[PDB]
């Protein structure tokens, strides 16, 4: 029942959870660390001035 205990963890984790509110809504600034991995750099369209 390892799946059952993990299900219980997940259900306890989302209980009373409001995804409409960011973490630290009124008392802190949310800091998002960002990273980009470029798997390909597509072609460059000179006519459309885009890439």
């Amino acid at each position: 029942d390892n799946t059952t205990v993990f299900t219980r963890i997940l259900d306890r984790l989302l209980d009373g959870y409001d995804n409409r509110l960011r973490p630290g809504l009124g008392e802190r600034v949310t800091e998002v660390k960002t990273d980009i991995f470029v798997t390909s750099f597509g072609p460059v369209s000179d006519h459309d001035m885009e890439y």
Partner: protein, 46 residues
């Protein structure tokens, strides 16, 4: 906690909210103001 206070307030705001009905359904018209920030005008095609 402040976030729990906000969650309770939003749950209050959305309870009994009728999305079928515009604000002031049987009353004066609701005034809507429009703003636009134009990011680009791309391809004017003849």
């Amino acid at each position: 906690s402040n976030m729990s206070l906000v969650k309770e307030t939003v749950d209050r705001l959305l309870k009994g909210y009728d999305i079928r009905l515009r604000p002031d359904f049987g009353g004066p018209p609701v005034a809507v103001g429009m703003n636009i920030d134009i990011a680009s005008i791309d391809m004017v095609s003849e």
